Design a protein around this nucleic acid. Structure first.
Ligand SMILES: [Mg+2]
Ligand SMILES: [Mg+2]
Lengths: 165, 432
RNA sequence: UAUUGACGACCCCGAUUGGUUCUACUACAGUUUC
RNA sequence: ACUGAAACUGUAGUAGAACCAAUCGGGGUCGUCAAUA
């Protein structure tokens, strides 16, 4: 690795983020492709022609996650979930999901969890000393947004297949 | 030589996301797949003009002086969506440094002395800026029913909140030029299809859009076609461009963040709206500007309310709005018609018919038009063209009658004639 | 066989579209030395 | 029984055209609840 004091350490950091961002985007595409993984990660599932929850309920969550720019915005997303969880008719919309509301609560509030689902070996993608811990803290919110965005897209375009049978 | 220039966004401001939708011309509702979003650099962002010019002759080319005059006039547009609100730039603080690289005193100046200043005003005095033909349309209007475009997603105390945008230090409510263009285009097409009795129902949305005259005014998608063994592009840019319209009212960015994050409609929302409306101690005036409304769906057998169907709207009942700016590029149409200014009259005739309906409340704007919003009163349309051809020169007018009776009857009767002659044979008018 | 005896609020957003279509490289310089 | 020299992968080219954040919904209203003697 580059020594921490090295003058090009600022330039290496630009290269690493680029290599990490593309790795996260590629891995998020693969994980959305399989219905067992979308169910593992968010609890979402397809049951016949039906979607659990409705695509409108996924879309509503996703619109809030757009505001998750930083870890200190996780108040925004957890605030949405508690208000949802407090209204009986809305909480039951997410019954018949695999624990979906807790899985979303965890993904947003447990800072380690996104990286375990992505499960990327970042060692070939980093060159700065202490680069891994820094980049994880910086790119966390973006990885969460990318993975949730990918999963809902992959869900909908498999829902279209079950629909069109 | 033109360098890359980094954009410095204003303080605290950030990249905005603009939502977009395509509305099916038959059902009047969002078309399937036609939902998109665009990141935009907010208004008032700055970047450096980074030009260098290597003169082999003496002096400075007059066309290059006209260019800099055009930048200072703000006549140049940059980037995407140029017809739909975006892209206008204006130059400030122009500075000219000359290095006489042909001579020793000049070549060392390049290496050391940082050059010789020129007074721009001395060049700016030796030329007349020749603006190209255009017709500016300014519509002065006020909301008769609350006018808003809906925000990107549901709120806490209020589900449906108005769209706002940063404009320097403050946020303002905004109606995007995309929205104003889209309502105008829809009425223009309905007029054309009505005249021809051409149905729109069997066409998909990209084919629904593609009809005569509107293909030139509002523009068409790029689409290559081997139409006759010859290969041709159907795409052309809109000769008609529309600006974003902002509210006269403004709020500090945190003052609106207090509204977005209120959670009790009768609780902490009331302080936030008293703040933002500018009546921090007088809610009965605050709610004459932004008024929360509640709605229910009432179940048809039981009455009462349908389970779950309770929702609320922050209605900008009293927000005052600045005049809408529409810019018609007469040069771009005239190029489409291969110069023939006779061919402008059907396109100009269509545009005036669209504006007649706008002033007659036939074109509502924004969210909820069928649900208690969106109807506008137009007080005045000002038509202000530059370098118009002499037979269109009567357009330069301020109109206050909705029925165009402020345009000369001989001119309105001339346009009616060219229009009627096109109705009798609605050819592709740019087909040479 | 038909008595016992008076309280109490509810809904809190729901459904959906989440990108569609076109352009995907085009001209060249292919060795130079009056 | 002698290293060729000298030579900018460069020049021209706006990630752009078309696209409505939109459709539907009265801030509404009556009998229930408990089981025995
Ligand atoms: Mg609420
Ligand atoms: Mg609600």
């Amino acid at each position: 690795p580059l020594p921490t004091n090295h003058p090009t350490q600022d330039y290496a950091r630009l290269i690493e983020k680029a290599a990490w961002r593309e790795a996260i985007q590629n891995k998020a595409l693969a994980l959305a492709s399989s219905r067992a993984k979308r169910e593992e990660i968010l609890g979402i599932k397809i049951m016949g022609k039906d979607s659990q929850p409705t695509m409108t309920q996924l879309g509503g969550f996703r619109s809030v996650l757009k505001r998750l720019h930083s870890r200190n915005n996780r108040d925004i997303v957890t605030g949405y979930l508690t208000a949802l969880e407090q209204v009986s008719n809305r909480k039951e919309k997410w019954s018949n999901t695999s624990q979906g509301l807790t899985k979303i609560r965890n993904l947003v509030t447990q800072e380690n969890l996104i990286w375990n689902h992505l499960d990327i070996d970042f060692s070939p993608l980093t060159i700065t000393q202490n680069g891994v811990n820094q980049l994880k803290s910086e790119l966390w919110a973006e990885a969460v947004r990318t993975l949730v965005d990918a999963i809902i897209r992959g869900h909908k375009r498999d829902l279209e297949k079950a629909q069109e049978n | 030589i033109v360098d890359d220039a980094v954009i410095h966004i204003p303080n605290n401001a950030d990249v905005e996301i603009r939502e977009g939708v395509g509305i099916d011309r038959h059902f009047g509702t969002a078309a399937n797949g036609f939902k998109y979003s665009r990141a935009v650099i907010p208004k008032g962002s700055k970047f450096k003009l980074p030009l260098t010019f290597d003169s082999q002759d003496d002096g400075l080319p007059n066309a290059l002086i006209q260019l800099l005059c055009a930048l200072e006039a703000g006549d140049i547009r940059l980037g995407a969506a140029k017809t739909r609100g975006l892209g206008r730039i204006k130059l400030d603080d122009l500075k000219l440094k000359s290095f006489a690289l042909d001579k020793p005193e000049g070549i060392f100046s390049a290496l050391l002395d940082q050059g010789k200043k020129l007074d721009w005003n001395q060049l700016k005095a030796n030329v007349t800026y020749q603006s190209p033909p255009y017709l500016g349309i300014s519509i002065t209007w006020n909301p008769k029913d609350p006018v808003m475009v809906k925000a990107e997603g549901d709120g806490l105390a209020i589900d449906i909140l108005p769209l706002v945008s940063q404009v320097g230090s403050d946020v303002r409510f905004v109606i995007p030029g995309s929205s104003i263009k889209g309502i105008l285009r829809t009425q223009a097409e309905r007029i054309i299809r009505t005249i021809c009795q051409s149905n729109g129902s069997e066409k998909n949305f990209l084919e629904q859009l593609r009809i005569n005259l509107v293909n030139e005014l509002f523009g068409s998608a790029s689409l290559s076609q081997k139409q006759n063994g010859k290969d041709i592009d159907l795409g052309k840019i809109g000769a008609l461009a529309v600006n974003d319209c902002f509210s006269s009212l403004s709020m500090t960015p945190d003052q609106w963040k207090a509204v977005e994050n209120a959670t009790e409609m009768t609780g902490n929302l009331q302080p936030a709206l008293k703040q933002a409306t500018g009546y921090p101690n007088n809610i009965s005036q605050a709610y004459k500007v932004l008024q929360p409304a509640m709605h229910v769906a009432v179940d048809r057998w039981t009455g009462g309310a349908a389970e779950g169907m309770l929702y609320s709207v922050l209605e900008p009942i009293g927000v005052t709005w600045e005049p809408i700016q529409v810019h018609l590029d007469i040069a771009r149409l005239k190029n489409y018609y291969h110069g023939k200014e006779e061919k402008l009259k059907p396109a100009i005739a269509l545009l005036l018919l669209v504006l007649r309906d706008l002033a007659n409340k036939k074109i509502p704007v924004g969210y909820g038009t069928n649900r208690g919003m969106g109807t506008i009163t137009v007080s005045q349309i000002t038509l202000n063209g530059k370098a118009l051809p002499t037979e269109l020169e009567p357009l330069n007018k301020t109109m206050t009658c909705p029925n165009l009776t402020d345009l000369d009857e001989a001119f309105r009767q001339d346009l009616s004639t060219a229009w009627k002659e096109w109705i009798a044979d609605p050819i592709d008018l740019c087909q040479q």
